[PDB]
Homo-oligomer: A and B are copies of this chain.
C-alpha cells in the first residue's frame, strides 16, 4: 500500500491523517520537530494526508515541499 516520506525543516510541523469513508475529518495529528522524518502509509483508517508547516516530502510521484506560515 503506498506511503509518503516527510522531513520537518522546522519545529512544529504537522502530519494530519484524515478518516477513510463517508465522513472526512482529522483523526490524528503527529508533531515533527526540525529534522525528524515520518514515514507514513495510506491505510484502512487513513485515505488522505495533510502536511502543515515547512517540510520536505517524497512520494511515488516525486519530491514536493510544503511551506509554513
Enumerate chain A interface residues (CB-CB to B < 8 A). 1-5, 7-8, 17-18, 20-22, 24, 27-28, 30, 32-52, 54-69
Chain B nearest CB from A65 CB (Å) reads 8
Contacting residues, chain B, for A48 (C-beta < 8 A)? 3, 30, 38-41
B21 x A44 contact (CB < 8 A): yes
Number of copies: 11
Determine the main DSSP class of A at the interface with B: strand
Q: How many angstroms between the C-alpha atoms of A45 and B23 in the bound complex?
A: 9
A68 x B33 contact (CB < 8 A): yes
Q: How many angstroms between the C-alpha atoms of A4 and B50 in the bound complex?
A: 12
Q: How many angstroms between the C-alpha atoms of A47 and B63 in the bound complex?
A: 21
